[PDB]
Amino acid sequence: TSILDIRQGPKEPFRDYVDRFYKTLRAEQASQEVKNAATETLLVQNANPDCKTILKALGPGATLEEMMTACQGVGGPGHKARVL
Fold it and tell me: Could you tell me where this protein is found in the cell?
């Protein structure tokens, strides 16, 4: 029931992971240093390595949309497609 259990699952998307992270966070919102602590930092730290790199490239305070966008980018991406 800890935040440690909140990790970036394989078949599980980043959305479900975030939900879990915030689920546990709001399950025992507390810490020896919540202020000094950085949820986003925990999610990233408790997030896969690749995602970690993507987050590292992102910025020290990326938006949720940016975080999930980068996570979604993880692995063989696919979106862009059109002709000019």
Answer: Virion
What is the crossing angle of helices 64-73 and 14-25, to 10°? 140
Is residue 70 within 8 Å of residue 51, measured between CB atoms? yes
Alpha carbons 61 and 55: distance in angstroms, whole number: 9
Number of domains into which the chain is organized: 1
**Alpha-helix residue ranges (DSSP H) falling in 1-84:** 14-25, 39-45, 49-58, 64-73
Structural domain including 83 reads 1-84
Q: For 1-84, list the strands marked E by DSSP.
A: none
CA separation for the pair 41, 38 (Å, rounded): 5
Nearest C-alpha neighbor of 40 from the set 16, 73, 64: 64
CATH number of the domain that residue 23 is part of: 1.10.1200.30
